[PDB]
Design a protein around this ligand. Structure first.
Ligand SMILES: *[C@@H]1O[C@H](CO)[C@@H](O[C@@H]2O[C@H](CO)[C@@H](O)[C@H](O)[C@H]2NC(C)=O)[C@H](O)[C@H]1NC(C)=O
Ligand code: MAN
Length: 221
């Protein structure tokens, strides 16, 4: 179990819970057809009304930790339980207002992921563990400036040999992309992008040879 609960933007740490809708617990989302798949559920109130300014091309860290509290000292399951092999993914969706409560009907484009490297037997979850929960990626430099949600997700495939079984740990950050250009990428629906037939979601980690994370191809400029 893990929770995304804070951001760093071009090396500036914004603070615990700032600009993130933090779920109350590290319990997983398990239903890919639920609206909970979009941004999780049961947010800590009052939800942050900070919308982080991030230049297009900027480096963001989405910070995962074992619990909703963030860093609370040594913990062998922080940032995640390293037995829980699986991918890490990040998506953006353009939104009218990054503080708006309704997150349905948005169009999500993937900007980064890390799946599995067969030759090293290393998962994205392993890299996220090594890096202290710091899921680090750049915002595409060509994007249309304005308000976006930043959906960052750790999937545990430990029990994913059937569906349901995959455990989805995710939150949405609230950002305002500055600078940039005029690209408005094609996105996918949540729910909808993930299905029970996706081998990225139904996988036996002790039978894995090759692996492809679920959802669309990564967008690039
Ligand atoms: C993950 O990112 C965090 C947050 O930036 C790093 O913590 C900071 O480390 C810097 C550089 O040493 C310090 O100046 C900050 O005060 C730290 N921030 C906080 C909130 O404590 C952390 O080192 C990174 N972890 C790894 C493995 O890279
Ligand atoms: C944000 O910062 C990283 C270094 O942490 C760069 O690699 C990236 O290009 C962006 O400038």
């Amino acid at each position: 179990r893990t929770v995304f609960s804070s951001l760093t933007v071009n090396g500036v740490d914004l603070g615990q819970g700032v600009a993130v809708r933090v779920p109350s617990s590290n319990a997983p989302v398990t239903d890919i057809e639920s609206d909970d798949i979009i941004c999780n559920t049961g947010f800590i109130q009052p939800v942050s009304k900070t919308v982080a300014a991030v230049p297009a091309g900027g480096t963001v860290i989405a910070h995962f930790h074992h619990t909703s509290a963030g860093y609370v000292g040594p913990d062998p399951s922080d940032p995640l339980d390293p037995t829980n092999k699986g991918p890490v993914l990040a998506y953006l969706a353009k939104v009218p207002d990054a503080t708006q409560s309704d997150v349905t009907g948005l169009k999500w484009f993937k900007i980064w992921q890390d799946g599995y490297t067969p030759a090293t037997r290393q998962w994205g979850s392993d890299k996220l563990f090594i890096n202290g929960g710091n899921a680090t990626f750049t915002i595409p430099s060509c994007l249309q400036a304005g308000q976006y949600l930043l959906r960052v997700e750790s999937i545990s495939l430990l029990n994913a040999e059937q569906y349901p079984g995959a455990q989805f740990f995710l939150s949405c950050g609230q950002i305002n992309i500055t600078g940039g250009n005029k690209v408005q990428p094609v996105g996918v629906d949540f729910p909808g992008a993930y299905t029970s037939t996706d081998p990225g979601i139904v996988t036996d980690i002790y039978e894995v040879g090759t692996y492809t994370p679920p959802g669309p191809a990564v967008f690039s400029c």
